[PDB]
Design a protein around this motif. Structure first.
Motif, PDB file in Angstrom:
ATOM      1  N   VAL A  60       8.014  64.622 -61.886  1.00 20.35           N
ATOM      2  CA  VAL A  60       9.181  64.221 -61.099  1.00 20.35           C
ATOM      3  C   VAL A  60       9.898  65.450 -60.556  1.00 20.35           C
ATOM      4  N   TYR A  63       8.357  66.943 -57.443  1.00 20.77           N
ATOM      5  CA  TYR A  63       8.498  66.182 -56.214  1.00 20.77           C
ATOM      6  C   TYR A  63       9.930  66.132 -55.705  1.00 20.77           C
ATOM      7  N   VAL A  64      10.936  66.172 -56.592  1.00 18.61           N
ATOM      8  CA  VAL A  64      12.302  65.999 -56.092  1.00 18.61           C
ATOM      9  C   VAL A  64      12.992  67.317 -55.806  1.00 18.61           C
ATOM     10  N   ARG A  75      20.982  67.369 -52.390  1.00 12.30           N
ATOM     11  CA  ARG A  75      19.996  67.870 -53.346  1.00 12.30           C
ATOM     12  C   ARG A  75      20.349  67.367 -54.745  1.00 12.30           C
ATOM     13  N   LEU A  76      19.318  67.117 -55.565  1.00 14.59           N
ATOM     14  CA  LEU A  76      19.565  66.663 -56.932  1.00 14.59           C
ATOM     15  C   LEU A  76      20.081  67.820 -57.774  1.00 14.59           C
ATOM     16  N   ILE A  79      17.641  65.573 -63.523  1.00 17.13           N
ATOM     17  CA  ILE A  79      16.976  64.307 -63.770  1.00 17.13           C
ATOM     18  C   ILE A  79      17.092  64.011 -65.255  1.00 17.13           C
ATOM     19  N   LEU A  87      17.991  59.899 -61.432  1.00 18.95           N
ATOM     20  CA  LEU A  87      18.112  61.041 -60.533  1.00 18.95           C
ATOM     21  C   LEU A  87      19.579  61.285 -60.234  1.00 18.95           C
ATOM     22  N   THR A  89      22.925  63.509 -58.645  1.00 18.08           N
ATOM     23  CA  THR A  89      23.403  64.433 -57.628  1.00 18.08           C
ATOM     24  C   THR A  89      24.927  64.445 -57.614  1.00 18.08           C
ATOM     25  N   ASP A 154      19.097  60.281 -49.926  1.00 18.32           N
ATOM     26  CA  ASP A 154      18.105  59.264 -50.335  1.00 18.32           C
ATOM     27  C   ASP A 154      16.749  59.448 -49.639  1.00 18.32           C
ATOM     28  N   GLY A 156      12.491  61.238 -50.380  1.00 17.87           N
ATOM     29  CA  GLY A 156      11.514  61.853 -51.264  1.00 17.87           C
ATOM     30  C   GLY A 156      10.886  60.935 -52.281  1.00 17.87           C
ATOM     31  N   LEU A 157      11.340  59.688 -52.388  1.00 17.59           N
ATOM     32  CA  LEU A 157      10.887  58.853 -53.496  1.00 17.59           C
ATOM     33  C   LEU A 157       9.597  58.106 -53.202  1.00 17.59           C
ATOM     34  N   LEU A 160       6.943  60.509 -54.151  1.00 16.46           N
ATOM     35  CA  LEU A 160       6.934  60.662 -55.607  1.00 16.46           C
ATOM     36  C   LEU A 160       6.171  59.515 -56.265  1.00 16.46           C
TER      37      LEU A 160
END
Ligand SMILES: *CCC(=O)N1[C@@H]2CC[C@H]1C[C@@H](n1nc(-c3ccc(Oc4ccc5c(c4)ncn5C)c(C)c3)c3c(C)ncnc31)C2
Ligand SMILES: [Cl-]
Length: 308
Positions: A60, A63-64, A75-76, A79, A87, A89, A154, A156-157, A160
Protein backbone atom coordinates in the motif's frame (compact mmCIF):
# COMPACT_ATOMS: atom_id res chain seq x y z
CA UNK A 1 4.67 9.17 5.42
CA UNK A 2 4.08 7.14 8.61
CA UNK A 3 2.70 3.75 9.55
CA UNK A 4 0.01 4.59 12.12
CA UNK A 5 -1.21 2.37 14.95
CA UNK A 6 -4.95 2.02 15.30
CA UNK A 7 -4.80 3.58 18.80
CA UNK A 8 -3.47 6.76 17.19
CA UNK A 9 -6.68 7.44 15.22
CA UNK A 10 -10.25 8.19 16.24
CA UNK A 11 -13.14 8.79 13.85
CA UNK A 12 -15.41 11.64 14.92
CA UNK A 13 -17.94 11.91 12.09
CA UNK A 14 -18.62 10.74 8.58
CA UNK A 15 -18.00 13.24 5.77
CA UNK A 16 -19.11 11.32 2.67
CA UNK A 17 -18.26 8.64 0.19
CA UNK A 18 -16.26 8.17 -3.01
CA UNK A 19 -15.01 5.22 -5.03
CA UNK A 20 -13.71 2.29 -2.91
CA UNK A 21 -14.28 3.84 0.53
CA UNK A 22 -15.88 6.24 3.00
CA UNK A 23 -14.22 9.41 4.34
CA UNK A 24 -14.40 10.35 8.03
CA UNK A 25 -13.29 13.41 9.90
CA UNK A 26 -10.97 12.14 12.62
CA UNK A 27 -8.35 13.02 15.19
CA UNK A 28 -4.74 11.83 15.00
CA UNK A 29 -2.91 11.80 18.33
CA UNK A 30 0.71 10.90 17.47
CA UNK A 31 1.85 7.92 19.51
CA UNK A 32 3.36 8.98 22.81
CA UNK A 33 2.13 12.57 22.62
CA UNK A 34 -0.89 14.57 23.68
CA UNK A 35 -1.38 16.88 20.70
CA UNK A 36 -4.55 16.45 18.61
CA UNK A 37 -4.38 16.81 14.83
CA UNK A 38 -7.50 16.93 12.62
CA UNK A 39 -7.33 14.45 9.77
CA UNK A 40 -9.49 12.92 7.09
CA UNK A 41 -9.49 9.13 7.05
CA UNK A 42 -10.62 7.15 4.01
CA UNK A 43 -11.56 3.60 5.01
CA UNK A 44 -11.62 1.19 2.09
CA UNK A 45 -14.76 -0.90 1.78
CA UNK A 46 -14.19 -4.61 2.15
CA UNK A 47 -13.78 -6.55 -1.09
CA UNK A 48 -16.92 -8.72 -1.32
CA UNK A 49 -15.67 -11.02 -4.12
CA UNK A 50 -15.70 -14.72 -3.06
CA UNK A 51 -12.75 -15.51 -5.35
CA UNK A 52 -10.71 -12.48 -4.23
CA UNK A 53 -7.49 -13.13 -2.32
CA UNK A 54 -8.27 -13.38 1.42
CA UNK A 55 -4.91 -11.70 2.19
CA UNK A 56 0.35 -5.38 3.32
CA UNK A 57 1.83 -2.12 4.51
CA UNK A 58 4.73 -2.11 2.04
CA UNK A 59 2.47 -2.73 -0.94
CA UNK A 60 0.00 0.00 0.00
CA UNK A 61 2.77 2.46 0.90
CA UNK A 62 4.49 1.96 -2.46
CA UNK A 63 1.28 2.77 -4.34
CA UNK A 64 0.00 5.72 -2.30
CA UNK A 65 3.37 7.52 -1.91
CA UNK A 66 3.02 9.16 -5.31
CA UNK A 67 2.34 12.73 -6.40
CA UNK A 68 3.52 14.30 -3.14
CA UNK A 69 5.10 17.43 -4.63
CA UNK A 70 2.38 19.88 -5.76
CA UNK A 71 0.51 22.49 -3.69
CA UNK A 72 -2.58 21.67 -5.75
CA UNK A 73 -2.93 17.95 -4.98
CA UNK A 74 -3.36 16.21 -1.65
CA UNK A 75 -0.87 13.77 -0.14
CA UNK A 76 -1.32 11.09 2.53
CA UNK A 77 0.41 11.52 5.84
CA UNK A 78 -0.05 7.94 6.99
CA UNK A 79 -1.72 4.60 6.62
CA UNK A 80 -3.12 2.22 9.21
CA UNK A 81 -3.61 -1.43 8.20
CA UNK A 82 -5.49 -3.70 10.55
CA UNK A 83 -8.75 -5.45 9.76
CA UNK A 84 -9.35 -2.46 7.46
CA UNK A 85 -7.21 -0.17 5.30
CA UNK A 86 -7.22 3.42 6.61
CA UNK A 87 -5.65 6.18 4.49
CA UNK A 88 -4.94 9.39 6.39
CA UNK A 89 -4.41 12.95 5.20
CA UNK A 90 -4.59 16.52 6.51
CA UNK A 91 -8.17 17.70 6.83
CA UNK A 92 -8.76 20.55 4.40
CA UNK A 93 -10.42 23.09 6.71
CA UNK A 94 -12.92 24.70 4.33
CA UNK A 95 -14.39 21.58 2.76
CA UNK A 96 -15.00 21.25 -0.96
CA UNK A 97 -15.30 23.91 -3.64
CA UNK A 98 -18.65 22.46 -4.76
CA UNK A 99 -20.27 23.39 -1.45
CA UNK A 100 -18.50 26.75 -1.43
CA UNK A 101 -19.91 27.89 -4.76
CA UNK A 102 -23.38 26.51 -3.97
CA UNK A 103 -23.55 28.50 -0.75
CA UNK A 104 -22.15 31.75 -2.12
CA UNK A 105 -23.75 31.87 -5.59
CA UNK A 106 -23.77 35.53 -6.69
CA UNK A 107 -21.39 36.71 -3.96
CA UNK A 108 -18.46 35.09 -5.83
CA UNK A 109 -16.09 37.09 -8.05
CA UNK A 110 -14.87 36.32 -11.56
CA UNK A 111 -11.26 36.53 -10.37
CA UNK A 112 -11.80 33.78 -7.78
CA UNK A 113 -13.60 31.47 -10.24
CA UNK A 114 -10.87 31.73 -12.89
CA UNK A 115 -8.11 31.39 -10.27
CA UNK A 116 -9.62 28.13 -9.02
CA UNK A 117 -9.93 26.85 -12.60
CA UNK A 118 -6.26 27.60 -13.13
CA UNK A 119 -5.17 25.90 -9.91
CA UNK A 120 -7.20 22.77 -10.70
CA UNK A 121 -5.51 22.67 -14.13
CA UNK A 122 -2.13 23.02 -12.39
CA UNK A 123 -2.87 20.05 -10.16
CA UNK A 124 -4.00 17.91 -13.10
CA UNK A 125 -0.96 18.93 -15.10
CA UNK A 126 1.17 17.70 -12.19
CA UNK A 127 -0.73 14.41 -12.03
CA UNK A 128 -0.11 13.99 -15.75
CA UNK A 129 3.60 14.73 -15.20
CA UNK A 130 3.80 11.94 -12.58
CA UNK A 131 1.80 9.62 -14.88
CA UNK A 132 -1.18 9.22 -12.49
CA UNK A 133 -4.63 9.19 -14.14
CA UNK A 134 -7.18 10.56 -11.65
CA UNK A 135 -10.40 8.90 -12.97
CA UNK A 136 -12.80 10.94 -10.78
CA UNK A 137 -12.18 14.67 -11.09
CA UNK A 138 -15.26 16.67 -10.03
CA UNK A 139 -15.84 19.79 -7.99
CA UNK A 140 -16.68 17.68 -4.94
CA UNK A 141 -13.06 16.42 -5.11
CA UNK A 142 -11.54 19.92 -5.20
CA UNK A 143 -10.84 20.89 -1.60
CA UNK A 144 -10.41 24.36 -0.10
CA UNK A 145 -7.30 24.97 2.07
CA UNK A 146 -7.80 28.73 1.98
CA UNK A 147 -9.75 31.10 -0.27
CA UNK A 148 -6.83 31.36 -2.76
CA UNK A 149 -5.60 27.74 -2.46
CA UNK A 150 -7.46 24.62 -3.63
CA UNK A 151 -6.20 21.01 -3.87
CA UNK A 152 -7.39 17.99 -5.89
CA UNK A 153 -7.93 14.86 -3.79
CA UNK A 154 -8.94 11.15 -3.98
CA UNK A 155 -6.71 9.42 -6.52
CA UNK A 156 -4.46 6.39 -6.86
CA UNK A 157 -6.76 3.72 -5.47
CA UNK A 158 -7.98 1.95 -8.62
CA UNK A 159 -4.43 1.04 -9.51
CA UNK A 160 -3.59 0.10 -5.91
CA UNK A 161 -6.47 -2.37 -5.87
CA UNK A 162 -6.00 -3.35 -9.56
CA UNK A 163 -9.75 -3.40 -9.79
CA UNK A 164 -12.17 -1.67 -12.11
CA UNK A 165 -14.64 0.40 -10.09
CA UNK A 166 -17.61 -1.38 -11.68
CA UNK A 167 -16.29 -4.75 -10.42
CA UNK A 168 -15.86 -3.55 -6.82
CA UNK A 169 -19.41 -4.51 -5.90
CA UNK A 170 -19.04 -3.01 -2.41
CA UNK A 171 -19.51 0.36 -4.17
CA UNK A 172 -23.05 -0.62 -5.12
CA UNK A 173 -22.61 -0.03 -8.85
CA UNK A 174 -22.31 3.75 -8.56
CA UNK A 175 -19.99 5.51 -11.01
CA UNK A 176 -19.72 9.21 -11.92
CA UNK A 177 -21.32 8.82 -15.35
CA UNK A 178 -22.11 12.50 -15.84
CA UNK A 179 -18.42 13.47 -15.44
CA UNK A 180 -16.90 10.66 -17.54
CA UNK A 181 -15.60 10.71 -21.10
CA UNK A 182 -17.59 8.55 -23.52
CA UNK A 183 -14.73 6.08 -23.89
CA UNK A 184 -14.62 5.65 -20.12
CA UNK A 185 -18.36 4.93 -19.98
CA UNK A 186 -18.40 2.47 -22.86
CA UNK A 187 -15.02 0.72 -22.67
CA UNK A 188 -13.77 1.59 -19.16
CA UNK A 189 -10.79 3.36 -20.78
CA UNK A 190 -9.22 6.03 -18.53
CA UNK A 191 -6.38 8.29 -19.67
CA UNK A 192 -5.15 11.78 -18.98
CA UNK A 193 -7.33 12.85 -21.88
CA UNK A 194 -10.42 11.39 -20.21
CA UNK A 195 -9.39 13.42 -17.15
CA UNK A 196 -9.56 16.47 -19.43
CA UNK A 197 -13.21 15.70 -20.13
CA UNK A 198 -13.90 15.58 -16.39
CA UNK A 199 -12.04 18.88 -15.97
CA UNK A 200 -14.46 20.51 -18.41
CA UNK A 201 -17.45 19.27 -16.39
CA UNK A 202 -15.75 20.50 -13.19
CA UNK A 203 -15.31 23.98 -14.72
CA UNK A 204 -18.99 23.85 -15.74
CA UNK A 205 -20.00 23.05 -12.15
CA UNK A 206 -18.00 26.01 -10.86
CA UNK A 207 -19.36 28.47 -13.41
CA UNK A 208 -22.97 27.44 -12.70
CA UNK A 209 -22.49 27.82 -8.90
CA UNK A 210 -22.72 24.08 -8.42
CA UNK A 211 -25.54 22.99 -10.73
CA UNK A 212 -25.92 19.25 -11.34
CA UNK A 213 -24.84 18.32 -14.89
CA UNK A 214 -27.65 17.00 -17.11
CA UNK A 215 -30.08 17.38 -14.22
CA UNK A 216 -33.19 15.29 -14.80
CA UNK A 217 -31.55 13.02 -17.40
CA UNK A 218 -31.06 9.42 -16.20
CA UNK A 219 -27.50 8.11 -16.17
CA UNK A 220 -28.53 5.24 -18.46
CA UNK A 221 -29.44 7.77 -21.21
CA UNK A 222 -26.15 9.73 -21.08
CA UNK A 223 -24.12 7.72 -23.67
CA UNK A 224 -26.85 8.09 -26.30
CA UNK A 225 -27.12 11.79 -25.47
CA UNK A 226 -23.41 12.36 -25.97
CA UNK A 227 -23.25 10.21 -29.11
CA UNK A 228 -25.94 12.42 -30.69
CA UNK A 229 -23.76 15.45 -30.05
CA UNK A 230 -25.65 17.08 -27.18
CA UNK A 231 -23.53 18.81 -24.51
CA UNK A 232 -23.92 20.75 -21.27
CA UNK A 233 -25.27 24.29 -21.94
CA UNK A 234 -23.40 27.56 -21.75
CA UNK A 235 -23.32 28.89 -18.15
CA UNK A 236 -24.84 32.40 -18.13
CA UNK A 237 -21.71 34.02 -16.59
CA UNK A 238 -19.33 32.54 -19.19
CA UNK A 239 -18.32 34.26 -22.37
CA UNK A 240 -18.25 32.13 -25.50
CA UNK A 241 -14.44 32.08 -25.17
CA UNK A 242 -14.64 30.12 -21.88
CA UNK A 243 -17.47 27.90 -23.10
CA UNK A 244 -15.38 26.99 -26.19
CA UNK A 245 -12.68 25.52 -23.92
CA UNK A 246 -15.34 23.38 -22.15
CA UNK A 247 -16.73 22.12 -25.50
CA UNK A 248 -13.23 21.14 -26.63
CA UNK A 249 -12.86 19.07 -23.46
CA UNK A 250 -15.98 17.04 -24.41
CA UNK A 251 -15.05 16.05 -27.94
CA UNK A 252 -15.42 12.30 -28.62
CA UNK A 253 -11.96 12.38 -30.23
CA UNK A 254 -9.80 12.31 -27.10
CA UNK A 255 -6.73 13.45 -29.02
CA UNK A 256 -8.44 16.71 -29.97
CA UNK A 257 -9.23 17.69 -26.38
CA UNK A 258 -7.00 20.35 -24.79
CA UNK A 259 -3.89 19.31 -22.88
CA UNK A 260 -3.63 20.25 -19.22
CA UNK A 261 -0.52 22.35 -19.87
CA UNK A 262 -2.49 24.40 -22.39
CA UNK A 263 -5.45 24.69 -19.98
CA UNK A 264 -3.06 26.07 -17.35
CA UNK A 265 -1.83 28.76 -19.71
CA UNK A 266 -5.31 29.64 -21.00
CA UNK A 267 -6.83 30.05 -17.55
CA UNK A 268 -3.79 31.96 -16.26
CA UNK A 269 -4.26 34.33 -19.19
CA UNK A 270 -7.97 34.78 -18.49
CA UNK A 271 -7.41 35.15 -14.72
CA UNK A 272 -5.26 38.22 -15.45
CA UNK A 273 -8.23 40.06 -17.00
CA UNK A 274 -11.16 38.21 -15.44
CA UNK A 275 -14.05 40.55 -16.23
CA UNK A 276 -13.39 40.12 -19.96
CA UNK A 277 -14.14 36.37 -19.67
CA UNK A 278 -16.57 35.83 -16.76
CA UNK A 279 -19.31 38.32 -15.91
CA UNK A 280 -21.36 37.60 -12.79
CA UNK A 281 -24.74 39.16 -13.37
CA UNK A 282 -27.30 41.00 -11.26
CA UNK A 283 -29.65 37.99 -11.64
CA UNK A 284 -26.99 35.80 -10.01
CA UNK A 285 -21.98 41.07 0.77
CA UNK A 286 -18.75 39.09 1.05
CA UNK A 287 -18.31 35.38 0.52
CA UNK A 288 -18.50 33.01 3.47
CA UNK A 289 -16.00 30.18 3.91
CA UNK A 290 -17.64 27.46 6.02
CA UNK A 291 -15.18 25.60 8.24
CA UNK A 292 -14.99 21.88 8.99
CA UNK A 293 -13.09 22.78 12.19
CA UNK A 294 -15.71 25.03 13.76
CA UNK A 295 -16.48 22.44 16.48
CA UNK A 296 -12.85 21.48 17.20
CA UNK A 297 -11.09 22.30 20.48
CA UNK A 298 -9.04 25.47 20.00
CA UNK A 299 -5.89 23.72 21.17
CA UNK A 300 -5.94 21.13 18.37
CA UNK A 301 -3.53 21.84 15.53
CA UNK A 302 -5.00 23.45 12.44
CA UNK A 303 -2.70 21.68 9.96
CA UNK A 304 -0.72 18.46 10.33
CA UNK A 305 2.33 20.17 8.81
CA UNK A 306 2.67 22.14 12.07
CA UNK A 307 3.54 18.82 13.73
CA UNK A 308 7.14 18.10 14.69
C1 LIG B 1 -17.75 18.78 -0.28
C2 LIG B 1 -17.67 17.45 -0.71
C3 LIG B 1 -17.72 16.54 0.35
O1 LIG B 1 -18.38 16.81 1.36
N1 LIG B 1 -17.05 15.39 0.19
C4 LIG B 1 -16.24 15.02 -0.97
C5 LIG B 1 -16.68 13.56 -1.26
C6 LIG B 1 -17.24 13.04 0.08
C7 LIG B 1 -17.06 14.21 1.07
C8 LIG B 1 -15.65 14.05 1.69
C9 LIG B 1 -14.72 15.11 1.13
N2 LIG B 1 -13.33 14.93 1.49
N3 LIG B 1 -12.64 13.82 1.05
C10 LIG B 1 -11.39 13.95 1.50
C11 LIG B 1 -10.54 12.83 1.16
C12 LIG B 1 -10.72 12.21 -0.10
C13 LIG B 1 -9.95 11.06 -0.40
C14 LIG B 1 -9.06 10.55 0.56
O2 LIG B 1 -8.33 9.45 0.21
C15 LIG B 1 -7.15 9.61 -0.48
C16 LIG B 1 -6.56 8.43 -1.02
C17 LIG B 1 -5.33 8.53 -1.74
C18 LIG B 1 -4.77 9.82 -1.85
C19 LIG B 1 -5.33 10.98 -1.32
C20 LIG B 1 -6.56 10.90 -0.61
N4 LIG B 1 -4.55 12.09 -1.59
C21 LIG B 1 -3.55 11.51 -2.26
N5 LIG B 1 -3.58 10.17 -2.48
C22 LIG B 1 -2.61 9.32 -3.17
C23 LIG B 1 -8.92 11.10 1.85
C24 LIG B 1 -7.96 10.49 2.86
C25 LIG B 1 -9.69 12.24 2.15
C26 LIG B 1 -11.28 15.17 2.24
C27 LIG B 1 -10.24 15.85 2.92
C28 LIG B 1 -8.81 15.36 3.02
N6 LIG B 1 -10.44 17.03 3.53
C29 LIG B 1 -11.71 17.51 3.44
N7 LIG B 1 -12.77 16.96 2.82
C30 LIG B 1 -12.53 15.78 2.21
C31 LIG B 1 -14.80 15.12 -0.43
CL1 LIG C 1 -15.19 14.50 -31.99
Amino acid sequence: MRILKETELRKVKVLGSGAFGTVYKGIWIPDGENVKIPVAIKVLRENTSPKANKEDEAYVMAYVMAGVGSPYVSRLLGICLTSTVQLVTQLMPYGCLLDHVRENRGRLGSQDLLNWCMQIAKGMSYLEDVRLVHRDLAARNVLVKSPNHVKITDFGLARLLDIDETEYHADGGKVPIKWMALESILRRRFTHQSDVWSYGVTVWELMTFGAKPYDGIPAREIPDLLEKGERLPQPPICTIDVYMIMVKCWMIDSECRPRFRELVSEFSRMARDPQRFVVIQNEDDSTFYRSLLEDDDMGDLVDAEEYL
